[PDB]
Amino acid sequence: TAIFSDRYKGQRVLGKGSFGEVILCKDKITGQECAVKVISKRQVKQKTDKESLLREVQLLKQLDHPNIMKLYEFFEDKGYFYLVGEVYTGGELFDEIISRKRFSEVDAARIIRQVLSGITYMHKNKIVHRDLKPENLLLESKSKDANIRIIDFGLSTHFEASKKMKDKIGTAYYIAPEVLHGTYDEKCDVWSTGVILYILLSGCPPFNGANEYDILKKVEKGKYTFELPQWKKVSESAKDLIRKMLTYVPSMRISARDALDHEWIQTYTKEQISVPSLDNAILNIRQFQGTQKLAQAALLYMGSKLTSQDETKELTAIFHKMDKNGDGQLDRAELIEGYKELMRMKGQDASMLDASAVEHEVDQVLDAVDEYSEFVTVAMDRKTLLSRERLERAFRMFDSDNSGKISSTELATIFGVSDVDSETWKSVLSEDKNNDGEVDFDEFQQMLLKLCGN
């Protein structure tokens, strides 16, 4: 077999996506940069057999469209799959939108035409996405005229969805009703695209609720309206398209290809042109995006705290066992070995892909120490860092008026999206013995710590 770390070295962590971590990697010979998704066999089950995954990868590697992520290679070892593809540096679609002055039906139409164009093409090759959502739409580069690239086509056919709310944040808004009941086809991608279209034009989900299951109930019933005030600013042809895409019975639902010929797409994408800014839509999208990202950061922070506890004590156990004389001390070599040992047990950390990468992390930890218990504390704080800073930056972003505080109403929203229990979070707060009806960042962080057994 060919080995992933023989070819690629990891540069830096790009983020978390469906089914695993994504690393920026570089070919050790040619210097080609690529994005690598590392899927752990221990945390993600396969729905299909080997042969079927291989033939699907062999197909994906051959496909080519300007709105679909390019896949280059695939590797597999004892514990992991590695999907190697083209790296995109423009970030998520919605983050580019919320940093705009104007946004019109014209900008929406140009977004949606690209999305429908990639989808159309993948459906002709019998590949269905199933989990189409804003996070899966990346901008190819930081440029102004950059294409949208859809990531994760085909994956959900081969790998089972996580049940953890860490991993499901914001998926219920987009999912087709028929995917909930088991019988689904390519039309599920049109539904998801109509949900995204609805949000682009109103800033709000068509099927919404106070918690994950409430949202799913709305989706299953399938009723939505155009009753919000900002829909008055919207053409009727956009409403007609949305209706066709959010048609409940999939055989009555419009195809991706047919949707590219809809009058709204034709009208509003003319290079010619022939139109107001939907400022309310943009405000709500800015609010939506901050809420989703704060809830996502809250869960990852809590998850990272539990992992940190689990690995801190295990490393301590490994190093104690390694301590042959029992004096509490170890040299550079034992530290490396013990750290490696930790990763056989707990699986490879995305950013430690080989023995060389562990050494530099050790050597980095030592540079800040220049006694195995000081090493443990420093090495673990360095794995929490990204979580603790992501949380603070996510709290700062969500606090749009810079008041330094989040109200109880906003906590409800955040904890509902995070699917944490109304009575449970209210109880943690109380342990705010003074009821301002609001919390600053330190208090919010204490709430989360208390919701994960600290």
Which residues contact ligand 1FB (rule: CB under 6 A)? Answer: 14-15, 17, 22, 35-37, 69, 83, 85, 87-88, 138, 151-152
Q: How far is CA 65 from the centre of its chain?
A: 23
**Four-residue CA torsion sign, 97, 98, 101, 104:** positive
370 in a labelled binding site: yes
CA geometry: angle 82, 88, 90, nearest 5 deg: 145
Q: Residue 105 or 152: which CB sits closer to ligand 1FB? A: 152
Q: Residue 8 or 103: which CB sits closer to ligand 1FB? A: 8
Place of tokens 């034992």: 334
φ, ψ of residue 72 to 5 degrees: the values are -105, -45
| Minimum separation from the CB atom of position 410 to ligand 1FB (A) | 26
374 in a labelled binding site: yes
| Minimum separation from the CB atom of position 390 to ligand 1FB (A) | 13
Contact 125, 59 (CB under 8 A): yes
| Minimum separation from the CB atom of position 24 to ligand 1FB (A) | 8
| Minimum separation from the CB atom of position 114 to ligand 1FB (A) | 16
| Minimum separation from the CB atom of position 82 to ligand 1FB (A) | 9
405 in a labelled binding site: yes
Contact 242, 191 (CB under 8 A): no
419 in a labelled binding site: no
Q: 380-408 burial string, b = 16+ CB within 10 Å, else e?
A: beebeebbbebbeebbeebbeeeeebbeb
95 in a labelled binding site: no
Q: Is 131 a catalytic residue?
A: yes
- Name the active-site residue from 131, 152, 167, 349: 131
Per-residue DSSP letters for 333-365?
HHHHHHHHHHHHHH---TT--SHHHHHHHHHHH
CB contact set of 289 (below 8 Å; sequence gap of 6+): 94, 95, 98
Q: Residue 153 or 264: which CB sits closer to ligand 1FB? A: 153
403 in a labelled binding site: yes
Contact 254, 190 (CB under 8 A): yes
Binding residues: 37, 323, 325, 327, 329, 334, 370-371, 374, 399, 401, 403, 405, 410, 432, 434, 436, 438, 443
Residues belonging to the active site: 131
Binding residues for ATP: 37
Binding residues for Ca(2+): 323, 325, 327, 329, 334, 370-371, 374, 399, 401, 403, 405, 410, 432, 434, 436, 438, 443
